[PDB]
Amino acid sequence: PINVAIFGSTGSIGTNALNIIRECNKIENVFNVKALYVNKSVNELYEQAREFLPEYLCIHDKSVYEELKELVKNIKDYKPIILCGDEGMKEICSSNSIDKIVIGIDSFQGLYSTMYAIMNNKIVALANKESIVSAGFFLKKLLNIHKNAKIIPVDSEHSAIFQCLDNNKVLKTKCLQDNFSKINNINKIFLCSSGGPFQNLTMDELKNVTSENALKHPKWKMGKKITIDSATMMNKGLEVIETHFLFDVDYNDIEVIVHKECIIHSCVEFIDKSVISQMYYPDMQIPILYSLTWPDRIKTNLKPLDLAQVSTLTFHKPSLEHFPCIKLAYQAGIKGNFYPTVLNASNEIANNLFLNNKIKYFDISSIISQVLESFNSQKVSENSEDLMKQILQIHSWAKDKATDIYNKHN
Amino acid sequence: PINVAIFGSTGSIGTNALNIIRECNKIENVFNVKALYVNKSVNELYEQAREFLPEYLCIHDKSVYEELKELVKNIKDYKPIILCGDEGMKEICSSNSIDKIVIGIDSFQGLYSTMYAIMNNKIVALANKESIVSAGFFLKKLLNIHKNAKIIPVDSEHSAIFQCLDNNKVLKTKCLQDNFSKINNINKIFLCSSGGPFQNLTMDELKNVTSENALKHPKWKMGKKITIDSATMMNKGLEVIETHFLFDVDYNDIEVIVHKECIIHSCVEFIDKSVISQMYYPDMQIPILYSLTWPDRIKTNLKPLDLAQVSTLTFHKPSLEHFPCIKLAYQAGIKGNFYPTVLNASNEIANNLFLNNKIKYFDISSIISQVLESFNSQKVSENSEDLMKQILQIHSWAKDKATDIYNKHN
Numbered sequence: 096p097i098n099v100a101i102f103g104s105t106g107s108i109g110t111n112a113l114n115i116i117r118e119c120n121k122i123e124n125v126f127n128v129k130a131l132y133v134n135k136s137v138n139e140l141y142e143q144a145r146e147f148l149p150e151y152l153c154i155h156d157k158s159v160y161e162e163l164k165e166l167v168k169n170i171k172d173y174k175p176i177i178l179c180g181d182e183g184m185k186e187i188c189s190s191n192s193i194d195k196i197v198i199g200i201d202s203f204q205g206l207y208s209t210m211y212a213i214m215n216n217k218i219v220a221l222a223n224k225e226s227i228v229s230a231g232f233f234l235k236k237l238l239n240i241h242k243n244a245k246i247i248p249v250d251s252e253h254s255a256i257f258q259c260l261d262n263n264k265v266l267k268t269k270c271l272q273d274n275f276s277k278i279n280n281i282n283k284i285f286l287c288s289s290g291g292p293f294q295n296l297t298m299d300e301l302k303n304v305t306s307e308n309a310l311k312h313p314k315w316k317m318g319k320k321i322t323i324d325s326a327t328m329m330n331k332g333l334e335v336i337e338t339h340f341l342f343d344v345d346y347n348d349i350e351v352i353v354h355k356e357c358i359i360h361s362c363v364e365f366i367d368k369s370v371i372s373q374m375y376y377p378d379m380q381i382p383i384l385y386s387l388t389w390p391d392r393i394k395t396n397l398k399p400l401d402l403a404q405v406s407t408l409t410f411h412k413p414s415l416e417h418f419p420c421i422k423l424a425y426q427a428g429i430k431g432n433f434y435p436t437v438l439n440a441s442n443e444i445a446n447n448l449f450l451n452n453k454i455k456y457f458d459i460s461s462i463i464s465q466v467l468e469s470f471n472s473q474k475v476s477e478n479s480e481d482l483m484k485q486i487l488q489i490h491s492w493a494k495d496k497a498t499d500i501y502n503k504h505n
Numbered sequence: 506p507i508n509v510a511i512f513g514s515t516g517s518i519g520t521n522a523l524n525i526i527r528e529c530n531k532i533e534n535v536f537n538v539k540a541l542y543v544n545k546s547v548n549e550l551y552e553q554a555r556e557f558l559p560e561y562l563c564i565h566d567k568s569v570y571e572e573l574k575e576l577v578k579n580i581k582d583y584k585p586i587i588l589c590g591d592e593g594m595k596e597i598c599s600s601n602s603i604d605k606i607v608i609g610i611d612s613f614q615g616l617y618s619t620m621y622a623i624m625n626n627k628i629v630a631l632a633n634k635e636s637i638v639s640a641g642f643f644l645k646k647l648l649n650i651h652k653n654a655k656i657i658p659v660d661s662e663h664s665a666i667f668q669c670l671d672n673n674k675v676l677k678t679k680c681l682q683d684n685f686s687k688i689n690n691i692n693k694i695f696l697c698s699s700g701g702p703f704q705n706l707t708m709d710e711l712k713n714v715t716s717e718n719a720l721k722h723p724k725w726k727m728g729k730k731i732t733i734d735s736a737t738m739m740n741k742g743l744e745v746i747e748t749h750f751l752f753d754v755d756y757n758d759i760e761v762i763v764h765k766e767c768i769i770h771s772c773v774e775f776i777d778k779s780v781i782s783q784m785y786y787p788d789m790q791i792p793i794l795y796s797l798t799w800p801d802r803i804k805t806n807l808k809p810l811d812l813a814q815v816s817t818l819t820f821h822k823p824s825l826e827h828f829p830c831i832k833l834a835y836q837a838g839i840k841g842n843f844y845p846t847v848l849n850a851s852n853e854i855a856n857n858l859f860l861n862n863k864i865k866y867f868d869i870s871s872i873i874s875q876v877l878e879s880f881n882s883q884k885v886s887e888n889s890e891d892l893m894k895q896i897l898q899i900h901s902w903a904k905d906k907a908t909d910i911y912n913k914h915n
């Protein structure tokens with residue numbers, strides 16, 4: 096049986112993870128949900144606890160810790176370990192009864208939980224792409240120290256890439272390890288994008304777009320931050336850098352392709368020029384499931400892909416003039432050093448300014464570009480605690496710099 | 506270094522194999538071409554021998570054997586073993602210096618060479634689909650006796666399927682084994698078809714199509730027999746049965762899909778419902794190369810697939826009313842026993858009758874149907890020699906029955 100912890104169990108990734116676990120367990124008992132962790136949502140955690148009966152419960156917000164204790168007395172024959180804060184999270188990661196940890200939290204809690212999962216030599220099903228973009232050097236260093244820890248990608252395109260690889264080769268390496276691409280015979284990556292809501296707008300139309308336009312009648316329902324990133328294609332920019340770090344693929348060997356039907360999730364070209372791709376309806380259950388079953392697969396009752404009904408699949412190049420965030424992401428990646436940390440942090444601010452109607456579409460890439468221009472490369476700390484501090488300090492600087500640029504040219 | 510024999514080195518498969526071998530060897534010395542075998546083309550074989558310098562040369566036709574000996578004296582620093590006939594073929598298959606054998610011969614000599622390759626525990630890169638359809642039971646039995654022998658598929662769709670599988674699972678089994686699909690977590694197959702030249706034709710138009718219509722300026726340039734089979738979609742019907750035998754996939758789990766662009770070569774749905782597909786320009790060099798490099802891949806200088814330029818990929822269901830040969834193939838496969846032998850043999854006759862303007866389009870399916878209706882199931886021989894004789898006798902009976910039906914109606 097596979098013993099799983101879910102970090103951020105009431106968010107999108109967390110709820111998809113529990114749905115697919117529930118459905119797969121109805122077919123055959125394969126998963127034991129050993130731990131659930133949430134930020135604030137105390138009642139949603141109680142209902143999850145009543146169904147899944149995990150050995151561990153944890154909540155980041157200590158104000159609702161005592162409430163959680165009392166609600167759990169209602170559940171028949173159930174004596175869980177009930178925890179809170181970063182220390183509760185550390186205790187879950189260090190349990191010998193947990194094999195695999197799904198990271199469905201963003202920002203610091205996502206990086207912090209990922210770090211502790213790796214330090215305890217766990218399999219880490221990572222859906223927080225910002226952690227890899229901002230802290231890739233630190234994650235690499237940590238994975239080199241903790242030899243049995245593994246990151247398995249959950250981000251849909253990176254799961255697709257991972258699914259296209261031969262496990263007889265994958266098992267001789269691991270994600271974020273130097274030479275990953277060489278061992279897997281990877282030549283090039285087609286990184287698929289939906290194109291987002293603004294894909295067919297003229298330059299004159301793009302100048303006027305608002306966050307309400309991006310959020311309204313969305314093709315796929317997801318969080319506000321990623322929805323804005325999908326609109327600017329900075330989601331795909333971040334995913335380019337994610338691809339480079341996870342798979343050791345050179346930036347010149349990553350091609351972004353707009354695939355509006357969202358059936359093909361990405362493709363891998365091998366050194367012989369044969370191309371392998373992964374396909375399904377747009378649904379996060381498949382990527383999450385594979386991260387927990389890899390290197391095996393298990394039966395589901397998901398709807399089978401009906402290719403004749405789908406009928407038509409399309410592919411085109413993105414315009415870098417319309418989506419300058421893509422260009423900036425490649426430039427930051429190629430420059431290397433901590434420029435990806437700076438890209439991510441400045442985008443965090445610019446995204447939120449646009450979300451809250453403070454700046455226009457092209458101001459997003461303008462602010463990011465200016466922050467990148469204001470950063471100087473730094474010698475990379477050799478010590479891992481120093482390296483984490485260096486990343487956090489650069490992240491903090493870059494957010495402040497974006498905000499100062501906004502405040503100046505108001 | 507990979508020691509390879511090519512049987513039928515002057516045919517389409519053989520010439521494509523030597524081309525990709527040549528081109529890969531320019532990049533890195535990977536292949537040693539150890540043997541070449543042709544029917545009658547002494548001059549062509551001499552030219553191949555001058556380039557590839559194989560240890561063995563063999564020619565079926567005895568009347569050009571001495572001609573071959575004297576031609577080869579012109580080649581500097583070269584003393585090959587020069588052989589003739591079925592006896593030379595057997596000697597090549599028993600050589601300890603040969604590891605992999607490409608079977609690019611059709612009809613009996615294809616099956617006969619495959620048998621000898623398997624008896625000598627070789628890797629057999631098999632392009633002759635008719636041998637799998639007709640003699641699947643016999644090949645399966647032989648592969649269970651000779652445990653180190655393997656069949657690796659070269660037929661493009663079956664190569665695609667094979668390339669979509671995890672070699673960490675494939676290496677626990679082999680093609681044509683019972684439980685192959687179970688070990689590989691296969692649920693269902695999408696078997697891609699070009700559709701041939703007649704997808705837009707009405708039933709009344711199909712009634713009058715001729716072999717010239719099927720052959721003149723076709724989509725893909727290939728031999729006359731397969732071109733006719735592509736027009737009727739009996740090519741795909743045979744490939745359904747091939748899929749069943751190679752991969753132990755139930756007929757209800759094989760779906761034929763018309764994909765006119767011929768970029769996606771087939772797809773595999775796994776038990777979780779994730780789908781993997783293999784893609785490239787239509788080109789036999791990739792399937793041939795993978796059969797010789799499996800479980801590894803090597804570098805080529807082939808043109809990279811440009812997905813944006815391709816732009817659109819399409820999929821639709823074939824009409825069984827318009828292409829009744831597909832229905833007949835499924836019916837024969839599902840009925841089992843030696844009905845696939847009968848299907849293949851009757852089609853051999855009907856195809857050739859149509860090719861020579863002796864019968865009409867729907868007469869092809871009419872003749873095949875009638876021969877199928879005229880066959881009675883037989884107890885399947887347990888002895889491998891009795892089984893081979895049983896298959897050959899049924900093959901001969903079915904050709905004769907098809908010819909008698911034609912003659913009576915004529």
Ligand SMILES: CN(O)C(=O)C[C@@H](CCCc1cccc(F)c1)CP(=O)(O)O
Nearest residue numbers: 251288289290291325330357377378379
């Ligand atoms: C789902 N995922 O990993 C995303 O990054 C969001 C993508 C893809 C949305 C469609 C999709 C694909 C796969 C699963 C899913 F839930 C939803 C939007 P893009 O940045 O390409 O414009």
Ligand SMILES: CN(O)C(=O)C[C@@H](CCCc1cccc(F)c1)CP(=O)(O)O
Nearest residue numbers: 661698699700701735740767787788789
């Ligand atoms: C190539 N191949 O294995 C065929 O069976 C011929 C097919 C496919 C021809 C296109 C093609 C695909 C892959 C390689 C290639 F050389 C050519 C014709 P169909 O029966 O589907 O109408």
Ligand SMILES: CCN1CCOCC1
Nearest residue numbers: 426427430464467468
């Ligand atoms: C040109 C804007 N940036 C890109 C990243 O490198 C610094 C400069």
Ligand SMILES: CCN1CCOCC1
Nearest residue numbers: 836837840874877878
């Ligand atoms: C209906 C025509 N045939 C199909 C194969 O089984 C025998 C009958």
Ligand SMILES: [Mn+2]
Nearest residue numbers: 250251252334
């Ligand atoms: Mn993604």
Ligand SMILES: [Mn+2]
Nearest residue numbers: 660661662744
């Ligand atoms: Mn084929």
